[PDB]
Design an enzyme around this catalytic site. Sequence first.
Site, PDB file in Angstrom:
ATOM      1  N   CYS A  99      -0.163   2.697  -4.496  1.00  0.00           N
ATOM      2  CA  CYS A  99      -0.632   3.367  -4.833  1.00  0.00           C
ATOM      3  C   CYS A  99       0.293   5.032  -4.345  1.00  0.00           C
ATOM      4  O   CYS A  99       1.143   4.877  -3.733  1.00  0.00           O
ATOM      5  CB  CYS A  99      -2.351   3.841  -3.535  1.00  0.00           C
ATOM      6  SG  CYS A  99      -3.198   2.764  -4.245  1.00  0.00           S
ATOM      7  N   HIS A 128       0.466  -1.047   0.240  1.00  0.00           N
ATOM      8  CA  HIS A 128      -0.411   0.151   0.068  1.00  0.00           C
ATOM      9  C   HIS A 128       0.786   0.651  -0.226  1.00  0.00           C
ATOM     10  O   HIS A 128       1.993   0.856   0.391  1.00  0.00           O
ATOM     11  CB  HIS A 128      -0.958   0.010   1.119  1.00  0.00           C
ATOM     12  CG  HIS A 128      -1.813  -0.886   1.282  1.00  0.00           C
ATOM     13  ND1 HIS A 128      -3.187  -1.096   0.606  1.00  0.00           N
ATOM     14  CD2 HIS A 128      -2.823  -2.677   1.936  1.00  0.00           C
ATOM     15  CE1 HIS A 128      -3.956  -1.889   1.129  1.00  0.00           C
ATOM     16  NE2 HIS A 128      -3.649  -1.975   1.527  1.00  0.00           N
TER      17      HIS A 128
END
Lengths: 4, 4, 140, 140, 5, 92, 92
Positions: free
Chosen positions: C130, C88
Amino acid sequence: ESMX
Amino acid sequence: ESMX
Amino acid sequence: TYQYNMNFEKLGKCIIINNKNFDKVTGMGVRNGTDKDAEALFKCFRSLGFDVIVYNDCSCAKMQDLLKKASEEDHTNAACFACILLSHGEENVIYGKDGVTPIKDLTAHFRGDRCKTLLEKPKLFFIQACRGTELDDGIQ
Amino acid sequence: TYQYNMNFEKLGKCIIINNKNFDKVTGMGVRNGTDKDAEALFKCFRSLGFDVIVYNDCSCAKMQDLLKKASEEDHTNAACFACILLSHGEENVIYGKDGVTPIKDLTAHFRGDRCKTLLEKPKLFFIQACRGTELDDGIQ
Amino acid sequence: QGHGE
Amino acid sequence: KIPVEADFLFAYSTVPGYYSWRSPGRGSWFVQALCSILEEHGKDLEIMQILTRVNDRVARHFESQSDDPHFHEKKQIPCVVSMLTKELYFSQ
Amino acid sequence: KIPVEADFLFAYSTVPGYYSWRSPGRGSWFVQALCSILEEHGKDLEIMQILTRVNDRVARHFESQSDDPHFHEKKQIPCVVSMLTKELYFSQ
């Protein structure tokens, strides 16, 4: 779908 | 020299 | 003269950080599918000739120590270095199982003045994560 | 095929923004040598086949408007688009003679959804400007 | 190697 | 559909957070290099090949000179950001 | 001398500020694409050629699927940042  |  | 010299004994080391499960404090969910990616990347990079090793659910300190130790190794007989990060993330940072850490901190260890044995050799970083919350609607 | 289609009536438009003089309030000094860059780039890009236009000492509002209008023109018969910025800068930012404006806002006018006639065509941006104050001492 | 246009 | 951010290419004279050097008499290093390579190969090399050569020329051929020892003998490395989906050639 | 920031290459799955998509049953879009290109051209194409084809594959072959209309039919384009000074081939 999923997000990163 | 100079910086930008 | 226009290509990197690949005439070394080894292509190089390849570090894959596969973070799937995160601490509840982070609020990040499980990244299903990341094991398929890791195994796929493992075979591909192995085929190219890299000596790959996969580390799972790493904490921020673990990731930093992992990259630091790698930069302190002797790459004298390697043509290059590769690092793949799956996790992430947000603009400029990547998540460890316990929090975030600046991507710049992980890669600075390989600067020409901190890893002489990789000087003039390509240092590759592939990053799946991301970098914000914007969505691309596409067109036509 | 893996190459961009270049069979068009013309290669495309090339906009050069040559910022040399800045208002005292910005704290920026004259960029001596920038006229030489602009001259060389113009001949160079005209030589490649671009229709080049050179703007000088632009305000932030002028840079924004200038690019927004270029993106509203018809590019149907052009293969691509090129823009060259010569000025002072800071991270993610470029100086106009009266201040600072985000580089992202300057290039956003050309996204696929806002400039349909350049869709699937290469949009190039060359930027000569600082992006911070760190110095590279070098090694070896 | 050979990048040829 | 096509992503709205696709097909952009940014050729920066330096990397994020760093200064960029310019000679009052010859112009900026990056532009000097870019024009040099383009004059020789702008018509026969793919865009990434051109900018990679530009990267090497700026990295090897230039070093700053200043009385102030703080800005003396400094180096520079350009930065190419690509969202291109194809190879780019300026001719044929 | 050589710039200390030289010879690095970053291949990001997405552009700055955007989301990056991942299929729970097939893996992330970026890795699926990167692996298929490398399996077929990892040893005959230059690194930028490989990543450019990855960019096209991700941009054209993928599109999000979700119940929530806010995340329906979204696209993605990777981002390649290069400070390399030479061409890179994985062979010979």
